[PDB]
Amino acid sequence: LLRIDDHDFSMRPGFGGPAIPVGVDVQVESLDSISEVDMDFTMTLYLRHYWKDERLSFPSTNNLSMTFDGRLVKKIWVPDMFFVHSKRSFIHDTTTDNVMLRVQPDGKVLYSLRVTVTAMCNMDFSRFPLDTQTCSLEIESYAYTEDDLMLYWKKGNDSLKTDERISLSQFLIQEFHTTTKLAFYSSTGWYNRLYINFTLRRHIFFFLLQTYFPATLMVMLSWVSFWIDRRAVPARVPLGITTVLTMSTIITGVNASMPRVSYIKAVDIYLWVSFVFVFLSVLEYAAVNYLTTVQERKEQKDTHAIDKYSRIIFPAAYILFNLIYWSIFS
Amino acid sequence: LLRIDDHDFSMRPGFGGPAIPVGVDVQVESLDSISEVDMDFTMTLYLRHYWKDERLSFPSTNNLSMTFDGRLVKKIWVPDMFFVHSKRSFIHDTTTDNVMLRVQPDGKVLYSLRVTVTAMCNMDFSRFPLDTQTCSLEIESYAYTEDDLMLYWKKGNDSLKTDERISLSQFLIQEFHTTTKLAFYSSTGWYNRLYINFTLRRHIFFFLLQTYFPATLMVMLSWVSFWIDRRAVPARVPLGITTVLTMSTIITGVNASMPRVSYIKAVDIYLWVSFVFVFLSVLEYAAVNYLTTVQERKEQKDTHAIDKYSRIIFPAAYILFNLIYWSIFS
Amino acid sequence: LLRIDDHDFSMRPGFGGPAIPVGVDVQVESLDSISEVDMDFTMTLYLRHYWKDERLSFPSTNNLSMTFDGRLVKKIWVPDMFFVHSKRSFIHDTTTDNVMLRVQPDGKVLYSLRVTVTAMCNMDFSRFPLDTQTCSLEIESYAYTEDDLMLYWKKGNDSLKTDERISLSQFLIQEFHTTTKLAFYSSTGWYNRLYINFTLRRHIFFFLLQTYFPATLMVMLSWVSFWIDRRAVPARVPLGITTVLTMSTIITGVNASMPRVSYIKAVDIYLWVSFVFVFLSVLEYAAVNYLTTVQERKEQKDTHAIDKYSRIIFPAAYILFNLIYWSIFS
Amino acid sequence: LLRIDDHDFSMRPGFGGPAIPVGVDVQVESLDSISEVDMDFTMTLYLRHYWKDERLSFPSTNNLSMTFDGRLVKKIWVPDMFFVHSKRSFIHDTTTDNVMLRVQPDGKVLYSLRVTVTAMCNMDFSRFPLDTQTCSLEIESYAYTEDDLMLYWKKGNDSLKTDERISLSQFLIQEFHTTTKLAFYSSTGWYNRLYINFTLRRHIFFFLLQTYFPATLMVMLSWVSFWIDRRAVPARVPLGITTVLTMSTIITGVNASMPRVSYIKAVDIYLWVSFVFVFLSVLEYAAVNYLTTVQERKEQKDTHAIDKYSRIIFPAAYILFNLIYWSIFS
Amino acid sequence: LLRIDDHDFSMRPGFGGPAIPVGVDVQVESLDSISEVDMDFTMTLYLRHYWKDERLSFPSTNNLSMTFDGRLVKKIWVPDMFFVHSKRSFIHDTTTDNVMLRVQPDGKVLYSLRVTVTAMCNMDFSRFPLDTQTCSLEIESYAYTEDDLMLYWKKGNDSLKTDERISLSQFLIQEFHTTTKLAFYSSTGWYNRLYINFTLRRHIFFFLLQTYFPATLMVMLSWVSFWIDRRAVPARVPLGITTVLTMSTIITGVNASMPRVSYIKAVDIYLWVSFVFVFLSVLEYAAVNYLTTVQERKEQKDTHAIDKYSRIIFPAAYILFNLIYWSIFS
Ligand SMILES: *[C@@H]1O[C@H](CO)[C@@H](O)[C@H](O)[C@H]1NC(C)=O
Ligand SMILES: *[C@@H]1O[C@H](CO)[C@@H](O)[C@H](O)[C@H]1NC(C)=O
Ligand SMILES: *[C@@H]1O[C@H](CO)[C@@H](O)[C@H](O)[C@H]1NC(C)=O
Ligand SMILES: *[C@@H]1O[C@H](CO)[C@@H](O)[C@H](O)[C@H]1NC(C)=O
Ligand SMILES: *[C@@H]1O[C@H](CO)[C@@H](O)[C@H](O)[C@H]1NC(C)=O
Ligand SMILES: CCCCCCCC
Ligand SMILES: CCCCCCCC
Ligand SMILES: CCCCCCCC
Ligand SMILES: CCCCCCCC
Ligand SMILES: CCCCCCCC
Ligand SMILES: NCc1cc(=O)[nH]o1
Ligand SMILES: NCc1cc(=O)[nH]o1
Ligand SMILES: NCc1cc(=O)[nH]o1
Ligand SMILES: NCc1cc(=O)[nH]o1
Ligand SMILES: NCc1cc(=O)[nH]o1
Ligand SMILES: CCCCCC
Ligand SMILES: CCCCCC
Ligand SMILES: CCCCCC
Ligand SMILES: CCCCCC
Ligand SMILES: CCCCCC
């Protein structure tokens, strides 16, 4: 039917003349996974192209598009859009190459693909786990410049669609929108680009329950030593060192759960402040015991004031620190 | 034999006319693995197709189907069914492409494949480990719409078969059934879909033995401190902090075994309630010791009632909590 | 030399007539690895085929087989045997496709391959680590039924060979033998199958040394508390709780080493019985202390009998449990 | 247009004559990851080639370069540069082979590629985590020697470009520069090589906070035992052993975080010196207790001098060690 | 130039006659990694072949070898050497197939490849970590027997070269040499083989520092209990159980670092002997306390001799065990 053998398809339509417009339509299917260590995300989507080529015109009276088996792609001219800043990608081939080709009698062509793309996304972990991340996906032509191929969205803001089943266990996805920008390369010239933007928000309940509660509980447990009688040395001494050991074990367990190795985080600040409080509580009893021993030795030849002042100083200081910490990071 | 070279197979049979019916028969072989972190399952199955094409008719007197070496698939028209919402898939090729082709003299064609499909499945972990999960697999044509290709099960409910060796170590599989639905796409039209549904149930003995028994044992061990004489401070004090440390180690060990990071679970509720009970038991002795010291100091210038009331309050409260917890989640 | 271009190889020899016998010879090279979580094993083997085809006859006077470069496989008819219940497989291609083809002047053909096959194998872990496992590998034709292709071993029991270097670090391999069975499919008919069977036995020294010795040592250490004077409360109390903590740490460490998550095992029974013994030993001293305190309070207004009876009850009970456990599982 | 079918492209231009100059231009896109265990890095870059071939000349009046669909690469002569000391590499093929081809009327050809390369890099971990690492990437022709192909940078130092988004979470990248060297092979001759060099610096805050602070805190906690009265044996004895246990747990936790298994590191020196200090502190109290017991036994038939001297010796020794350690490694 | 189309290359040179000699030259580039669990190593090397074929002769006056683009390999006869006992292998294809072809006017042909080979190697872990391992790589023809193809090293011992950058972080590589052997197969005949041998030695400092030092330190710490006064029961009792717990934690940490699961090792012997010593030290104090209590009870109605004898017995026994252990394993 088509006069494929009568023309050479190694050259774009309108070779040597003005640029050929190409439209893009995208439908996002699902998001597979997000890796924070490698800073990338995986997305599966449908890609569509629109253009006109008079060399594919065939005589017909129905004036309706006809579907071909997709094996003609290797013989006709096809746009070569590629994903920028991508690490790995492939096209599904079960049970065959997922390629759709529709040609109208007047020469309008529709081309579709189903691809999986992995792209990088820089993340900021300063406000972890309260941080908010933004990522984007870029589409650009490889060989043809702006003077030979024009790339634009088919229907503007209506060219992007999202499946209702898109969801993530640890993140909340919202605010899908599209924008365009012009890029420049030193050795080749100017190219057009297409962007797909979205915003990710992290759930806070799990991190709070797993991290902040044990530290506060351990601090309150360490606060108990201020009320036991100072004469019970074999009871006062082991409590502080056991609290230190338990805090060390908690810190060791928390670190192995989530690897970041980037910079300081608010969770580390909280944990180290709690550790410093525990250390000061441990030193306080040693100071009290030394003073009591010196006083008894001097007397030889009532509750101590240090404990009474500590019982007021420590809780107020911890409350002030909590208020400052939850006001700085909101 | 077949007049392959005398016809063009780039167009479907009955091109430009009514839709061509296609039948589907599926036999499930085995299930490989199920991942809860990525929410997907792997399945190996046999796929079969039925259709009629007069272009493949050959003269014969036996009126019986004949088998070909499968190399004719690349030359004749073949349906292009694909699996929806799939992450990765492939066709086995050992020692060759597992493709079967049978053509009857009147033009009836049988086509078979052996594929492995990985598909996503959303899971709810609110009732873990008592939760029950349901998953499904979807089959749909890619290029041809409803007006060009009709997809239906060959024998209705009898078109699905399961191997007797299908089993899972951690899950129980039951209730295989099939259903059909019609789907719509904005930019292409309507398509038919086929569904394969099954239900998964989780075994409870392992989780119970590994999680609930140690917590109850630790709570009962912490309950021992209510009977030791209050004068044995170097014996009463270390017991509570050691119980707290042991509970913390148990919680740390349990968390690393199964990662979910989705939302609150009943196991977390049980563990944190046990931790709160241990913390209250620790604080009770400190309160008793402070009251006893104050009483002795006042007297200077019998079993305490707090222990007697605690010996009754704590076990009854824990029994009530256990009854409520096992009645809410059944 | 061969008249390949003068014949059509899309049809089997003797098309439309009786079945064509095919012989199979197998030589096992090595076993790569065995996974208990996924229940599969990896094997590398040589596969050979024997059949006769008069279309490949060439005139010769030496009456000896000649070797070809293997590129003729894509042009001539080749059997399409596939491995049943396999997960993944491939053919080595370094530095080229490992294919051997030998054709005798009278038309006898030899075909060889070198493949790696991963196949599933159900395992029973009830008697772990004393369990014994059996696995098998299946070979079957895909497209041709029994009425078109007959599959049998070339020399019966002598058709299987094993390399002398086959060994496993954790398993003992023995009793290689072959057997045949006939299989049926509802939608296609009957097919022949070939089986390769072997038996695996697990080494016991490592598991014994790593698991059973620490539990017995901890039980014997907990038994020490029965001889210390009851008046040393700050020495008797911490010992039991420290033993409980050590046993909990040991149980946590053992579980992370080997994941099964299938059902109860004998190791779990042993560990939980040891834990129950430790718990009872802990409760015994609390009961003794309460009774002694009550007796002293009554007296105010010699070794206790409980310890004397426990010193006899506990070791005898543990010995009886050990005898029962090692008699049930042999 | 091009007279591809009129010439044989199995031979290089100017076959049998002088060498054909080839220019190279490289633009680095991003760095994916760096592995210290396997000592390799991953890089994604654009590769460009420049050469002249009169066989591709076509008549034109615009005197401007024209772009082809890239399918002509398989038919024309193309340089075969390969990356030396590479482990794995591939060319992206989504949605098609990322190949650009531009031919001017006079025969000048531009060829571009987009590849991902993994290359080895030896690292020195003696000064970890203060170490500084240097890596390089090598490009060399495979088949053609120096007498047949000349390789050089197109514009010298200006032939290398770097993207502004290149960054690493754990490393700082700086000082990109290029250099050339001549290599020799015994069995083939001489070849030219191209180098891309960069320097990596490691961030120190995370390692300091995670490693050095706990050790100093534990040493200072162990220093507390010098001030408690010597008569409190049940308080002095457990403190040292608990400090030893906590230090052992810290060392165990630190080792599992970062695997090197190469040689001694400064962190190990610091940790073992701290452990030795803790061990000496433990032994000091035992010596003091033995001397006090002997003195009391002799007397039967004031603060001890050992503690007074230790209170001065230990902090000064630790400060001296810290100064020496931070002066040796700067 | 070459008369490729005038000859059939499906048959080896000298078909039906004497064997055709083939030379092999190998240059090792680097070793990637060594896995002890799977018992295999990865190697990257250059492979070269030498043979003569009069069918490739071309008229020339320079009498010098000419280089071709490597695309002629698919059309001419090429040897099919394969690696025996290999698990996986591939040929690098960036930016193209790394194949070199040189043909002299008289018909001498040079063929080169760049491959990565993974091969198994049985290891003995009885003397770990003092063990020494030896591995080898095997090269053999697949289809052609000895009567059709002769395989030998081109220059004997000088046919093997090693890069100066070959190194391993955990192993020392030395003594590269080559040898040949003749192999036999029951169903095909005799074949020649080529071997590449090397020896690996393990570094001892890391294992010593990480394993043997903590055990000796813990034993010496447990030895402290022999000097404290027997009347300090709340100080003597916790020390032994805490030492046992610390030793158990150390053993748990060491095991998770290196998995072998093969047989008993010397490190396990050392650790279990240390554990037995600690257990005996724990039991000694219990025996002493029981004897002292019985003596006091008898008296009612000086240092004990057991401690005095233990202070001599234990260190001498440990020194004797150390001498025996370091003399048996040298
Ligand atoms: C389309 O969306 C873009 C980005 O979301 C926005 O800037 C623009 O105003 C929108 N256009 C209309 C017509 O609403
Ligand atoms: C077939 O099965 C479906 C779903 O299981 C059910 O709704 C339907 O009633 C069944 N049909 C018959 C005829 O039993
Ligand atoms: C061959 O082996 C099978 C299975 O091992 C056995 O049943 C059969 O008796 C053997 N045949 C002979 C002839 O020994
Ligand atoms: C170019 O850079 C190299 C290496 O960085 C340097 O040696 C050389 O001097 C530079 N050349 C010029 C002209 O600056
Ligand atoms: C070559 O090396 C082999 C093995 O290393 C050795 O046996 C042989 O003697 C050597 N030959 C010569 C001539 O040195
Ligand atoms: C159940 C979550 C508790 C979080 C407490 C946070 C205290 C700062
Ligand atoms: C052997 C399983 C014991 C489960 C106990 C559960 C108590 C709530
Ligand atoms: C060295 C192995 C000891 C195993 C002891 C088993 C006791 C039941
Ligand atoms: C917050 C980092 C503290 C580092 C202390 C280092 C002491 C040598
Ligand atoms: C720094 C290594 C110490 C090794 C001590 C070994 C004692 C047997
Ligand atoms: N992104 C387009 C392009 C062309 C090129 O040579 N490098 O990048
Ligand atoms: N699922 C069918 C289809 C066609 C298309 O363009 N997108 O999806
Ligand atoms: N195992 C043979 C076969 C054929 C088929 O259609 N399904 O299985
Ligand atoms: N690196 C070039 C080359 C050629 C060869 O045979 N070995 O290396
Ligand atoms: N290693 C050569 C060979 C040939 C065969 O059939 N099996 O092995
Ligand atoms: C940079 C914050 C460090 C806090 C140490 C207590
Ligand atoms: C949301 C449940 C929290 C329980 C804390 C004790
Ligand atoms: C089913 C066995 C449980 C044992 C608990 C002590
Ligand atoms: C080689 C340094 C060892 C240090 C041991 C304290
Ligand atoms: C086989 C050696 C065992 C050692 C147990 C102490």
Tab-separated table of C-alpha atoms in Angstrom, chain E residues 94-306:
chain	number	residue	atom	x	y	z
E	94	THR	CA	32.312	-0.230	23.456
E	95	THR	CA	32.392	1.604	21.318
E	96	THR	CA	32.388	-1.412	19.003
E	97	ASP	CA	33.350	-5.081	18.980
E	98	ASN	CA	36.963	-5.205	20.197
E	99	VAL	CA	38.205	-7.406	17.354
E	100	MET	CA	41.476	-7.010	15.443
E	101	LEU	CA	42.249	-8.750	12.147
E	102	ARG	CA	45.562	-8.626	10.273
E	103	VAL	CA	46.300	-10.585	7.092
E	104	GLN	CA	49.703	-10.869	5.421
E	105	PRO	CA	50.049	-11.289	1.637
E	106	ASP	CA	51.175	-14.917	2.023
E	107	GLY	CA	48.078	-15.801	4.070
E	108	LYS	CA	49.245	-15.535	7.688
E	109	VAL	CA	46.415	-14.269	9.900
E	110	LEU	CA	46.421	-12.614	13.329
E	111	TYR	CA	43.242	-12.546	15.429
E	112	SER	CA	42.787	-10.777	18.764
E	113	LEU	CA	40.048	-10.447	21.377
E	114	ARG	CA	39.385	-8.750	24.719
E	115	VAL	CA	37.247	-10.866	27.052
E	116	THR	CA	36.294	-11.108	30.719
E	117	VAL	CA	36.158	-14.616	32.195
E	118	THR	CA	34.778	-15.868	35.514
E	119	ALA	CA	36.058	-19.315	36.492
E	120	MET	CA	35.650	-21.524	39.545
E	121	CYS	CA	38.479	-22.378	41.935
E	122	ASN	CA	38.218	-24.818	44.837
E	123	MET	CA	39.613	-23.428	48.091
E	124	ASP	CA	40.673	-25.005	51.386
E	125	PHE	CA	39.792	-23.049	54.539
E	126	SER	CA	41.230	-25.457	57.127
E	127	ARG	CA	44.199	-23.167	57.857
E	128	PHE	CA	42.245	-19.903	57.663
E	129	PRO	CA	43.399	-17.156	57.831
E	130	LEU	CA	46.906	-18.581	57.288
E	131	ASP	CA	45.802	-20.599	54.245
E	132	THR	CA	47.372	-20.396	50.787
E	133	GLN	CA	45.230	-20.874	47.680
E	134	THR	CA	46.060	-21.861	44.102
E	135	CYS	CA	43.857	-21.340	41.044
E	136	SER	CA	44.092	-22.012	37.318
E	137	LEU	CA	42.431	-21.095	34.024
E	138	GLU	CA	41.828	-23.564	31.197
E	139	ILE	CA	41.542	-23.014	27.435
E	140	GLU	CA	40.333	-25.723	25.057
E	141	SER	CA	38.872	-26.114	21.580
E	142	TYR	CA	35.197	-27.079	21.503
E	143	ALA	CA	34.360	-28.796	18.206
E	144	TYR	CA	37.684	-29.805	16.628
E	145	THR	CA	39.581	-32.712	18.190
E	146	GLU	CA	43.341	-33.295	18.298
E	147	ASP	CA	43.300	-34.945	14.859
E	148	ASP	CA	41.931	-31.742	13.279
E	149	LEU	CA	43.392	-28.873	15.346
E	150	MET	CA	46.646	-28.625	17.308
E	151	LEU	CA	46.812	-26.102	20.155
E	152	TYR	CA	50.124	-24.923	21.609
E	153	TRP	CA	51.762	-21.825	23.041
E	154	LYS	CA	53.392	-19.588	20.443
E	155	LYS	CA	56.700	-19.086	22.290
E	156	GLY	CA	56.526	-21.553	25.176
E	157	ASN	CA	57.142	-19.897	28.533
E	158	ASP	CA	57.418	-16.458	26.879
E	159	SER	CA	53.803	-16.531	25.636
E	160	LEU	CA	52.402	-15.152	28.923
E	161	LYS	CA	52.637	-11.495	29.956
E	162	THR	CA	51.276	-9.680	33.006
E	163	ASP	CA	50.483	-6.007	33.514
E	164	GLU	CA	52.474	-4.175	36.181
E	165	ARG	CA	49.270	-2.744	37.705
E	166	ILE	CA	47.803	-6.127	38.714
E	167	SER	CA	47.173	-6.043	42.462
E	168	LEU	CA	44.664	-7.080	45.117
E	169	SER	CA	43.775	-5.425	48.410
E	170	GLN	CA	43.498	-8.650	50.435
E	171	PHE	CA	45.732	-11.054	48.467
E	172	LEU	CA	49.291	-11.245	47.151
E	173	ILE	CA	49.722	-12.585	43.608
E	174	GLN	CA	52.910	-14.311	42.459
E	175	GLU	CA	54.365	-17.149	40.367
E	176	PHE	CA	52.621	-16.926	37.016
E	177	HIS	CA	53.487	-19.873	34.770
E	178	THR	CA	51.983	-21.947	31.969
E	179	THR	CA	51.617	-25.668	31.311
E	180	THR	CA	49.803	-27.967	28.893
E	181	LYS	CA	47.884	-31.213	29.309
E	182	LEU	CA	45.880	-33.630	27.166
E	183	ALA	CA	42.236	-34.318	28.030
E	184	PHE	CA	39.858	-37.098	27.010
E	185	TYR	CA	36.083	-37.246	26.566
E	186	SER	CA	34.156	-40.503	26.293
E	187	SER	CA	31.767	-39.508	23.493
E	188	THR	CA	33.997	-37.205	21.400
E	189	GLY	CA	37.683	-38.166	21.795
E	190	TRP	CA	40.842	-36.343	22.857
E	191	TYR	CA	41.431	-32.599	23.167
E	192	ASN	CA	44.351	-30.348	24.071
E	193	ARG	CA	44.240	-27.892	26.968
E	194	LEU	CA	46.218	-24.842	28.083
E	195	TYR	CA	46.701	-23.763	31.700
E	196	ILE	CA	47.510	-20.481	33.449
E	197	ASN	CA	48.543	-20.919	37.083
E	198	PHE	CA	49.053	-18.460	39.932
E	199	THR	CA	49.299	-18.499	43.724
E	200	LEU	CA	47.465	-16.327	46.260
E	201	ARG	CA	48.603	-15.470	49.791
E	202	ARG	CA	46.442	-13.768	52.410
E	203	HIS	CA	47.478	-10.866	54.627
E	204	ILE	CA	47.494	-11.713	58.327
E	205	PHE	CA	47.696	-8.355	60.155
E	206	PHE	CA	44.019	-7.420	59.808
E	207	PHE	CA	42.667	-10.778	60.982
E	208	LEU	CA	45.106	-10.924	63.902
E	209	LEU	CA	44.244	-7.411	65.086
E	210	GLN	CA	40.489	-7.881	64.664
E	211	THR	CA	40.219	-11.356	66.234
E	212	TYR	CA	43.076	-12.547	68.443
E	213	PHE	CA	43.718	-9.379	70.471
E	214	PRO	CA	40.182	-9.015	71.964
E	215	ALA	CA	40.077	-12.664	73.071
E	216	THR	CA	43.406	-12.411	74.900
E	217	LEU	CA	42.349	-9.101	76.454
E	218	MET	CA	39.090	-10.640	77.691
E	219	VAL	CA	40.921	-13.650	79.146
E	220	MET	CA	43.349	-11.363	80.979
E	221	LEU	CA	40.423	-9.269	82.255
E	222	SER	CA	38.712	-12.422	83.537
E	223	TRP	CA	41.975	-13.338	85.290
E	224	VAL	CA	41.563	-10.245	87.507
E	225	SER	CA	38.869	-11.898	89.654
E	226	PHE	CA	41.460	-14.162	91.319
E	227	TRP	CA	42.895	-11.277	93.385
E	228	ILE	CA	39.786	-9.530	94.748
E	229	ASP	CA	38.785	-10.485	98.286
E	230	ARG	CA	36.310	-13.366	98.436
E	231	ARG	CA	34.018	-11.438	100.803
E	232	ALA	CA	33.033	-8.994	98.020
E	233	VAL	CA	30.346	-11.239	96.549
E	234	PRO	CA	28.379	-8.396	94.842
E	235	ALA	CA	31.661	-7.463	93.109
E	236	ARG	CA	32.986	-10.934	92.259
E	237	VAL	CA	29.721	-12.380	90.909
E	238	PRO	CA	28.822	-9.766	88.230
E	239	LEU	CA	32.353	-9.663	86.789
E	240	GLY	CA	32.313	-13.244	85.511
E	241	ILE	CA	28.861	-13.050	83.940
E	242	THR	CA	29.701	-9.695	82.330
E	243	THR	CA	32.898	-11.206	80.909
E	244	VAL	CA	30.851	-14.113	79.532
E	245	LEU	CA	28.378	-11.683	77.950
E	246	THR	CA	31.188	-9.617	76.414
E	247	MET	CA	32.849	-12.738	74.997
E	248	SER	CA	29.510	-13.863	73.550
E	249	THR	CA	29.015	-10.458	71.913
E	250	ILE	CA	32.548	-10.574	70.483
E	251	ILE	CA	31.965	-14.065	69.069
E	252	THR	CA	28.653	-12.948	67.557
E	253	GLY	CA	30.297	-9.919	65.951
E	254	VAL	CA	33.225	-11.894	64.531
E	255	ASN	CA	31.036	-14.572	62.924
E	256	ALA	CA	28.910	-12.098	60.952
E	257	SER	CA	31.997	-10.490	59.383
E	258	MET	CA	33.226	-13.467	57.321
E	259	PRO	CA	30.903	-16.304	56.218
E	260	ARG	CA	32.501	-19.678	55.445
E	261	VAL	CA	30.081	-22.414	56.638
E	262	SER	CA	32.461	-25.143	55.443
E	263	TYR	CA	34.272	-26.804	58.375
E	264	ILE	CA	36.132	-26.058	61.611
E	265	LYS	CA	38.776	-23.319	61.518
E	266	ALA	CA	41.638	-22.392	63.832
E	267	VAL	CA	39.953	-19.109	64.796
E	268	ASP	CA	36.946	-21.058	66.087
E	269	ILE	CA	39.263	-23.302	68.117
E	270	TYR	CA	40.923	-20.263	69.699
E	271	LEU	CA	37.607	-18.554	70.472
E	272	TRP	CA	36.024	-21.663	71.996
E	273	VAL	CA	39.117	-22.383	74.106
E	274	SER	CA	38.947	-18.811	75.413
E	275	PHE	CA	35.240	-19.283	76.163
E	276	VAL	CA	35.965	-22.514	78.062
E	277	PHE	CA	38.652	-20.727	80.083
E	278	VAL	CA	36.185	-17.955	80.967
E	279	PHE	CA	33.563	-20.539	81.970
E	280	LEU	CA	36.040	-22.332	84.245
E	281	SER	CA	37.044	-19.006	85.804
E	282	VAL	CA	33.362	-18.313	86.494
E	283	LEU	CA	32.830	-21.724	88.122
E	284	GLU	CA	35.945	-21.399	90.301
E	285	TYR	CA	34.551	-18.505	92.344
E	286	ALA	CA	31.252	-20.326	92.875
E	287	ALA	CA	33.134	-23.350	94.211
E	288	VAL	CA	35.221	-21.115	96.489
E	289	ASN	CA	32.123	-19.346	97.824
E	290	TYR	CA	30.346	-22.634	98.537
E	291	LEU	CA	33.384	-24.000	100.378
E	292	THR	CA	33.739	-20.791	102.405
E	293	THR	CA	30.051	-20.840	103.362
E	294	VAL	CA	30.279	-24.488	104.441
E	295	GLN	CA	33.413	-23.749	106.479
E	296	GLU	CA	31.752	-20.793	108.217
E	297	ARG	CA	28.635	-22.850	108.971
E	298	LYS	CA	30.775	-25.636	110.445
E	299	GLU	CA	32.803	-23.165	112.523
E	300	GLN	CA	29.662	-21.499	113.897
E	301	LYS	CA	28.316	-24.816	115.210
E	302	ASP	CA	43.651	-16.041	105.116
E	303	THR	CA	43.415	-16.362	101.337
E	304	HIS	CA	41.810	-19.597	100.176
E	305	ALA	CA	44.097	-22.217	98.651
E	306	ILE	CA	41.931	-22.554	95.527
